[PDB]
Amino acid sequence: HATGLAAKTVEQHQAPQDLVLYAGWFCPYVQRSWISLEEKGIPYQYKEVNPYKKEQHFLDINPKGLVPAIEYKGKAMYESLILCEFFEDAFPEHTPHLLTTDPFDRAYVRLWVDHVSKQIVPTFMRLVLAQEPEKQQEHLADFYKGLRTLTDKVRGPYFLGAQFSLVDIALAPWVLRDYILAENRGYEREAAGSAWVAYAKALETRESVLRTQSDKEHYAQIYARYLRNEAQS
Amino acid sequence: SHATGLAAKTVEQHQAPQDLVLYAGWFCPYVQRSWISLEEKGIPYQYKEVNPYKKEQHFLDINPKGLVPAIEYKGKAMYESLILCEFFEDAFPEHTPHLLTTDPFDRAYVRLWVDHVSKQIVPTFMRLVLAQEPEKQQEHLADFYKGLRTLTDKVRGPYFLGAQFSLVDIALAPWVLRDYILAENRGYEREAAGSAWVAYAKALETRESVLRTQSDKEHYA
Numbered sequence: 001h002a003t004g005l006a007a008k009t010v011e012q013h014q015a016p017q018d019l020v021l022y023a024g025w026f027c028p029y030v031q032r033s034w035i036s037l038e039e040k041g042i043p044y045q046y047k048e049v050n051p052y053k054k055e056q057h058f059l060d061i062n063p064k065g066l067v068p069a070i071e072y073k074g075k076a077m078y079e080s081l082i083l084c085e086f087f088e089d090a091f092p093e094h095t096p097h098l099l100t101t102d103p104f105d106r107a108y109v110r111l112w113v114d115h116v117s118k119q120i121v122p123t124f125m126r127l128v129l130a131q132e133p134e135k136q137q138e139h140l141a142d143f144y145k146g147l148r149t150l151t152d153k154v155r156g157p158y159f160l161g162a163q164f165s166l167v168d169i170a171l172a173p174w175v176l177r178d179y180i181l182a183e184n185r186g187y188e189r190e191a192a193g194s195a196w197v198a199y200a201k202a203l204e205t206r207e208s209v210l211r212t213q214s215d216k217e218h219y220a221q222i223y224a225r226y227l228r229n230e231a232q233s
Numbered sequence: 234s235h236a237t238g239l240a241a242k243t244v245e246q247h248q249a250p251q252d253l254v255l256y257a258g259w260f261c262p263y264v265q266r267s268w269i270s271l272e273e274k275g276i277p278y279q280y281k282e283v284n285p286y287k288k289e290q291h292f293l294d295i296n297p298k299g300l301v302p303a304i305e306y307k308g309k310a311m312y313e314s315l316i317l318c319e320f321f322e323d324a325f326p327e328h329t330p331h332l333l334t335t336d337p338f339d340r341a342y343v344r345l346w347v348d349h350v351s352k353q354i355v356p357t358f359m360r361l362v363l364a365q366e367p368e369k370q371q372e373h374l375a376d377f378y379k380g381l382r383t384l385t386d387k388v389r390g391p392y393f394l395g396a397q398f399s400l401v402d403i404a405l406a407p408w409v410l411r412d413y414i415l416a417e418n419r420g421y422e423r424e425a426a427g428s429a430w431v432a433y434a435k436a437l438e439t440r441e442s443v444l445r446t447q448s449d450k451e452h453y454a
């Protein structure tokens with residue numbers, strides 16, 4: 001179960017609601033969708049899914065079995081980024097608009113969300129799973145490269161500037177987890193450049209992000225998560 | 234090096250300058266996705282052919298990654314076919330049809346299945362072209378059929394959502410137009426994927442906006 005401030009948030013979201021969020025406290029993809037709900041003040045019921053003992057209703061409405069998922073007005077959806085966009089569409093008067101209202105900026109947000117999903121997050125995983133120091137160093141260099149492609153475009157404090165957006169939300173969960181890299185894979189924020197130092201700090205101090213954060217897990221736990229993902233591959 | 238057939242007429246019809254400039258390659262199925270959306274929605278555009286062997290400096294200036302499709306609109310530029318398709322919905326909100334629908338849940342549903350097209354079906358198709366060994370080719374073809382049935386399990390007909398044409402259809406159509414490559418070179422035939430695939434491919438490749446973007450066929454080279 002969730003701990004820290006996240007435990008407070010879970011306890012405040014036990015009541016039934018039209019929107020049900022099927023979550024895992026540990027899951028960074030869930031955190032993306034959870035941050036969006038906390039940013040926009042959308043009402044939601046939080047249900048904790050134990051992946052080792054998934055309940056039957058969850059599987060009926062969500063047979064692929066991933067979190068996050070939602071049920072809303074009797075229909076179900078999954079995929080963290082799709083849910084983030086769905087919250088924008090389905091609660092149109094619940095500001096902030098995390099894609100902006102501007103058509104080009106919305107496209108630019110989607111482009112850089114894609115960079116997070118395609119480059120940054122997969123390399124984070126490959127670095128955790130790299131075994132030889134040489135392969136670890138190669139994947140760490142690639143992590144820096146992918147971080148720096150993004151920080152080249154960060155206006156500050158957030159990706160678009162003052163306006164928090166889905167680019168920030170897509171990435172923030174992995175900032176919260178980068179102590180794993182610092183403690184086990186030779187990473188330091190400073191080695192990716194000062195812009196990353198400042199942007200990481202901005203993401204991890206965002207109040208919505210803090211409200212979804214549990215106590216730090218151990219390396220063995222996340223490594224176990226990645227081996228389970230491999231086993232489901 | 235230029236569009237042919239029906240596509241050459243469409244190109245000829247879009248040489249005048251417009252607010253929206255589409256940087257295109259006639260052969261590119263990703264370009265076709267974005268081109269189809271413009272033709273569905275009646276958005277004014279100017280078509281510019283990018284020859285990949287001699288890219289204009291201005292195209293590289295405003296689009297350093299140098300991919301097509303790309304657009305220039307109001308001094309700003311963007312690329313990635315599906316992002317452009319969503320951009321057309323947002324930037325031209327009164328040009329119907331709304332190819333992701335106007336319903337929040339159905340929009341998410343469309344996004345989910347565009348992803349399955351984008352992340353599963355098209356990559357498998359591409360692994361099957363490049364595979365050379367019976368080993369990888371037999372595997373990728375089986376995978377390809379698996380992805381098609383999974384999709385046609387949800388096709389309502391004539392199109393993915395039913396009567397309403399959508400970005401799921403658009404994301405896949407260019408590879409329906411190209412599946413003769415698989416048929417002539419990799420043991421593929423629509424009929425092995427089920428009657429539903431046969432009908433849905435027919436529906437996609439007879440779509441007027443699709444036909445407008447269709448050049449003569451290329452060879453396995």
Ligand SMILES: N[C@@H](CCC(=O)N[C@@H](CS)C(=O)NCC(=O)O)C(=O)O
Nearest residue numbers: 027028029051066067068079080081
């Ligand atoms: N692409 C998905 C990834 C979601 C995902 O992989 N979630 C993991 C937990 S972090 C999961 O639910 N795995 C299924 C399981 O452990 O049984 C998304 O963006 O939501």
Ligand SMILES: N[C@@H](CCC(=O)N[C@@H](CS)C(=O)NCC(=O)O)C(=O)O
Nearest residue numbers: 261262263285300301302313314315
């Ligand atoms: N993910 C891109 C793929 C675009 C792509 O690969 N375009 C090819 C043409 S089919 C290209 O421009 N390659 C660069 C070149 O050949 O110069 C999209 O969806 O737009």
